[PDB]
Write a structure and sequence with these properties.
It is a peripheral membrane protein. By secondary structure, the protein is mainly alpha-helical. It has one domain. Helix content is 79%, strand content 0%. The chain contains one helix and no strands.
């Protein structure tokens, strides 16, 4: 109803979250 790209950003953000999580997972 509103849009669709924002709902898709979830699959685009998980890529940045994967590397972002690995950095904190490796060193904190």
């Amino acid at each position: 109803s509103g849009n669709y790209v924002l709902d898709l950003i979830y699959s685009l953000h998980k890529q940045i979250n994967r590397g972002l999580k690995k950095i904190v997972l490796g060193w904190a």
